[PDB]
């Protein structure tokens, strides 16, 4: 609405419209339109619907703005894989379930634009750190 520029970063859902909760007064009071965004954004999120793909916005002035789609959350795909729709208060005590390393191939093949790791082995053991504290165990590995 007013003459203001600067920066912006948030995390709205993927295949879900943008009502008042997502943006509205949030990124609207920075001189921008929600309408033209309720479309363009949810336009690229269709290829990856049923999640919440983080995306940063850049403001300039007047009624100008941009956006950069990222990779949707991967806690949803696993929950479905474990038949659970809620997290765990105790990630060491009461854990979630168990997967296979094949599920990590597609992790470092879509999240490669962000993963600045060395080569394979690097980002491959990087993602495990996120899995290890969530509530999911590693299958197989070295030796044996």
């Amino acid at each position: 609405m007013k003459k203001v520029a600067g920066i912006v970063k948030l995390q709205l859902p993927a295949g879900k419209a943008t009502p008042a909760p997502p943006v509205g007064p949030a990124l609207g009071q920075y001189g921008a339109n929600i309408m033209e965004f309720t479309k363009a954004f949810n336009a690229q999120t269709a290829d990856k619907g049923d999640a919440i793909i983080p995306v940063e916005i850049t403001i300039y002035a007047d009624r100008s703005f941009t956006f950069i789609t990222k990779t949707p959350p991967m806690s949803y795909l696993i929950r479905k894989a474990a038949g659970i729709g809620k997290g765990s208060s105790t990630p060491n005590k009461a854990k979630v379930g168990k997967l296979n390393w094949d599920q990590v191939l597609e992790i470092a093949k879509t999240k490669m634009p962000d993963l600045n790791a060395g080569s394979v082995e690097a980002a491959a053991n990087t993602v495990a750190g996120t899995a290890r504290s969530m509530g999911v165990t590693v299958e197989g590995g070295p030796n044996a």
Partner: peptide, 12 residues
């Protein structure tokens, strides 16, 4: 403004 998840906010 005023919340993280229902509907209002902040902005200046």
């Amino acid at each position: 403004s005023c919340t993280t998840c229902e509907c209002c906010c902040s902005c200046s």
